[PDB]
Design a protein around this ligand. Sequence first.
Ligand code: ZN
Ligand code: ZN
Lengths: 49, 1612
Amino acid sequence: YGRYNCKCCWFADTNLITCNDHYLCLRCHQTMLRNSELCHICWKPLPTS
Amino acid sequence: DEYVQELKGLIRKHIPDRCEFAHQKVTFLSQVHPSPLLTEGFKLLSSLVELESCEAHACQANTDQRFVDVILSDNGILCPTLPKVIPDGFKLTGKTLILLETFVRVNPDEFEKKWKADMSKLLNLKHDLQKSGVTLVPIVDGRSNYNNRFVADWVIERMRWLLIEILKASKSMLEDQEYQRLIHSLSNVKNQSLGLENLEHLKRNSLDYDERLNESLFIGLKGDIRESTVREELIKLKMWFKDEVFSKGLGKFKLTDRRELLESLSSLGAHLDSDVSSCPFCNNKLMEIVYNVTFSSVERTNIEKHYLSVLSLCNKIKGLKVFNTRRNTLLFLDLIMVNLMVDISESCQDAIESLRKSGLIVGQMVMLVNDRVLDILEAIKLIRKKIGTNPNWVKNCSKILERSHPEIWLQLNTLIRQPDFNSLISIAQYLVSDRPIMRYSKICRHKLFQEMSSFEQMRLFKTLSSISLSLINSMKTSFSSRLLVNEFGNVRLRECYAQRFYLAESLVGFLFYQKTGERSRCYSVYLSDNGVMSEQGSFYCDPKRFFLPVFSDEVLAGMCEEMTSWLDFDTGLMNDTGPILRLLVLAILCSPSKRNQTFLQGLRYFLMAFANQIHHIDLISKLVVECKSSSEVVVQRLAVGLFIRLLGGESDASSFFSRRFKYLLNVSYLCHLITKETPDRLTDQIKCFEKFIEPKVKFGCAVVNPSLNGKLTVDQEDIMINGLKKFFSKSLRDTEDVQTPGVCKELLNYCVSLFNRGKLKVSGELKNNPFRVVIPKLDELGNILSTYDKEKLVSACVSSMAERFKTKGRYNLDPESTDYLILKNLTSQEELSLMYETLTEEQVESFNEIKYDVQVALAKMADNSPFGVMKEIRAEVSLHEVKDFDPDVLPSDVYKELCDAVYKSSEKCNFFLEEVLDVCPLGLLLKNLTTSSYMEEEYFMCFKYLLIQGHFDQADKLDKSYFTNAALRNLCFYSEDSPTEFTSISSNSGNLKFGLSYKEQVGSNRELYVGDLNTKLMTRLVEDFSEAVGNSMKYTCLNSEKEFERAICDMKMAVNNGDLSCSYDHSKWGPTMSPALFLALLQMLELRTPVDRSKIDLDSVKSILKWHLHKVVEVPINVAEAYCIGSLSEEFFHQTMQLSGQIPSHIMSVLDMGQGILHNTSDLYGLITEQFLCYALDLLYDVIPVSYTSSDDQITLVKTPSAAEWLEMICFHEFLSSKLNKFVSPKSVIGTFVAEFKSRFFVMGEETPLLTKFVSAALHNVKCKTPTQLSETIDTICDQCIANGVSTKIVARISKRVNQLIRYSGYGDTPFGAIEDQDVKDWVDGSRGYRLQRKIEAIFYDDKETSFIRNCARKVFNDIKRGRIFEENLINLIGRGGDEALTGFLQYAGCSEQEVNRVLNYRWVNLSSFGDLRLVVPTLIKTLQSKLSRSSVASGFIGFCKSMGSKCVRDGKGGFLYIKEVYSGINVCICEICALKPKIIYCNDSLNKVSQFSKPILWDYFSLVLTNACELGEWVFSTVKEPQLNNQNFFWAVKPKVVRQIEDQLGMNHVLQSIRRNYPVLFDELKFLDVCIALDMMNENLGIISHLLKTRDNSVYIVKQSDCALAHIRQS
Ligand SMILES: [Zn+2]
Ligand SMILES: [Zn+2]
């Protein structure tokens, strides 16, 4: 993996689920689940649990 | 005394033809003594060239060599008490006279510095001689060798080749510094090697001044501090710093507090102090009129073209100047137009209503000659007045258009048709409406722009286009063009200039204004729906800032919809942020100003300060600019109203921060649409000078006039030396006086001494050692005719005419044969206007003064009642006259207007005449030429001529005969100013001048120093020296691309890796540092060359930056009189008025380094000192930094062990960096998310696209020479705009703006033209050479006509390759021409005659057929010479639409014609050949009358196929296959993948295959290269080798997946 901050929102450090090729927060996980299941940063599907 | 016998017989071969050489030689032969031999027998060679320039021009040489004051007193002329000069040749007659001086030089370096001194010495003779009542004509004669006619060029080199020993023998047998400059003057043709050793062999004398320099300038530097003593200093310093000055709060950085900034920005921007309105349209004045147009007409004919045809004949009939003035040649074709108007009134029942209010005449209005609305009835007064003044006016001018005239006319009867005044009143009484009113000097209803549907907003930009085009060609009007009626609340408009602009199929609008020119106007716009006029307002602007929108609805709506579509992650946010961007985009274009440019620039500093983590403390006190008017607030509520909207809401409004960043940075660059022009230059130079002078008198150093050659007085010196030791004052541990110039000398000691040891990452190793026309004056830069040209070409024209009527005795000037001389050498009645209309107003107002003083000179050439007191002579006439000293420079603002009418209105005397007499004999112009404006309506120029008429302008000497510094003026070729003995500060010759200018950058004015000719030569040495020094360094990146690339590759991987990367900048990095600092650095360097490991001497550099310490910076002359009329620079002047009151024209300094002079010599200083500071953090804060520098920008990337706890590092770095006067501007930002470097903003995980610089640069840079050259630059910038992945659609719509601006330019169309549309993959793989194939194979859309020429290309190309010759002698068959080379090749490959029948009938009309399109050998030679050898757009587009409709296309016979005459010379050929694409492809039968222009298109299609086979592929040949969803905003990077079938390294191989092409063309000027070099030399449209000698130069393309899966495929 790369750097240890969030790929989307950049300003969170703890409790991060390792997605496909990028870090990601619990806050902005939910503002992508309602739009799609396919992501819009890596354009590849992400873990569910 | 060994050649003393030879010399008298050597020069016996010059016959004393006059008295000039006869007394010279009889005192030569009678003196056999070398003590006067080399003075008096040396003064004949100066006497010999002196006769050549007096035999050349009209002249009488001064054989007495005496004064000017008594050469006028041999005539009866009273003594004027002139200054004292000696002229070297004259010619006097009447009350004018021709001075000529004479001097010959060899090198360019000290030739122009005699021209500039001689010309300044002669042009400061007029001011006592203008008062004498006489004007003179000055000339100079530059000679670059000895080219006499009276000798035969074989004896003069024997003189200087045998007198070159006689002075060495003369001063060895028997004065010091007057010797070797005489050698360098008497030396041969000097192709002289000039270098660092040129300084080395002079004298190096002293003054007992430079010791007081070194007493402050080298003292504390020892440079050899031990490397274990510095650590014990540094730990104490940090321990002092942290406990002393940090914790009591003096640090420059902080922790950014991300909530306070958004409250700070709302209080910054939303001007709740101001009282502006909420609606945007109400406040601005042009959006008002746009809203009135777009909702007065959106909610909702053979006589026409006959009228247009005869009016378009009236246009060409005006431009002749045949009717002896410019007044009746308006009224005459006025009479013609009004008779032809009433000649339509008698034809139909309804024509003047149904077809004339529907077109060209509104209520009581008429359209005619220039663009003039004339509004009938005043003509009826003026025409009746004209027939009243002359009883029979149309009886001679009725058909004076036959004799001395064209006599090609179509005016049947309207030449002679006397208009029945009793007939026009029926028409004039028929249509009457309210006359046009035009405003000078409260409720709202505007439908709330966010609440209008998504279609009619395009009807705002569409109307902005149509108004803006009429703004643009409101320059096209003639600039001379005085009206017929001359003369501030609200004015009803009698007649005016106007444009027309169409909106629908019934109605037009209008655009009324009074002034012509390029300056600001005061417009008004009406409508005309079906005959009814309706006013809609008045606004006030300047035209030339509105080039941008001119055809660009679809551009400005493709990028504002490209950009909004980025925000498909929050739909409810998108439908809000959409229509609030668009009003912004509209409002910026509708208001170009500096203030609403600068504020929009200042938001990219905010934005890095909101994503990153530490800003400088002073930034919010710098983003503010005072809104001077109530229109800069409308933008400063909607940008800020956008930034509060989507940066941070009170909730978690940071879902996808990256697109917010991209989308808002692209708003901060959306600034750039305003045209960089600095709207007026007399308010620009004052800001430039005032930005220069402020950091100087604050430190207190500026001086007045030095002597410009060495010496300085003591009082002038002491302020210099006090500034010097105040510079090096700066004790190391005081927190006061930290923002102050200077260097801490004890710390620079450490900085250079650790560099001596090899412990920095740079080291003093230094591979491959460095030790190996019109020229302006310097007080006015930015202008295009300086003072010195403008008398030079005048005096040259005076001499060129003064002889040509004394060759025969004409003694009369033709008033155009005197305007053929100037108007040629600055840049037959049709020829003059053919090259008169290609000027600019800036040159027109110079040309008129040239016409003035030329004709005044010629009027003075031939010559040998004040009781009109209505307004008094006593304090009005004589007062302004003596205050201004010329009649020439008179202003108009001391009087009223009507006195200009009435003091003109004295009756005729001997001051006037009648019968204006275009023969114009000489000796009468002083009374003839004033009548030319007595009869024309204008008055003021007649006032100036009537004022200029009536006299209203009022043995020791044998020791001294050898060249002493008093005996300098005895020779012309002495070369008085040669470098002989340089000093510590000067070079015995000059004082290293400079000059002022700005640079017209985007936000703020960058300055720019103009150097003179020696100054550039002495600056190249230091600059290239330090370039070689920094060549061996490791971390600079200014000139090396590769290290810059490594830094970019580092920053990309390092933001992805959790580092802390700063981004600094430096406020006034230019004007702060000092040349003495570079002296104090080069004292203690080593620079041991690895060839000979030794400490080299840099005294060639150490003695020449001392010169750079002491430059003489001039001042602009426009600010020498702008502060003179009426602000701390003005305070600085008006405290130097209280001294001895000389005007302050020369400023020696201490601390300049103007930007671009010592440029690379500070790039290593910003690398040496940067690495020293980079070492101070490896030892005091256990990290590992690395620090690039581009001489103005830095980045120091830091790893940390194991989050902004270590502010301590950064602030302490700031405190050290302030100790070397590298100050850190408050613009900088340091954090861990964003880093810039030279505007390439490198976010986490990506690169930021930055769309809106490329479009905004592509809509500009429309430069106009030929309409294919103009369709090359925009193809290049469309290659760059797709290098960063915009889309296809915006590229596909720049390519219609550029297309229609050509179709608007009269050109018609051609199959090449602008580049294609709907082009998708041909950006990555292939050049303009690939795309023109796709343009031409788009015509043959069934693709059944060009597959066969590709079949022929397959049969030729597999056989013209290797392994086979098969006519490699085809170099001749192409050179036949274009019509029959294809017939050669095709029947070479083989088919019937019927294929040649069905191929050669396709023809395109060429216009660059024989020659090229003329608007005042192929392009291959002029391109290859460029590998061999080494004003606004919107006023440069009108000269492309004025000199293209004129006589501009040529045949092979000598002459030119029109385009329409060619395009009238064509038939109609409906039979399916022309109906393929109309007006593009023709038949062969339809080009029957004009058949010398029809070339085939199939010839160039085969030409492109055989070029692209050379450069790539074997897939130029295949059938184009049919192409094959993803999200709109997933783009990724691609590479070229081009399969090249040549071998590389073509940097020389092209010239050595031009012997085997054309011997005479190489005379005057591989494996497959040569077959596609004659396919380029025969035409112009191929362009092959400029894409082979270089490379693709991007190779890194990024493309959208939905622009990459949609593209086509051509495999093999
Ligand atoms: Zn997030
Ligand atoms: Zn993703």
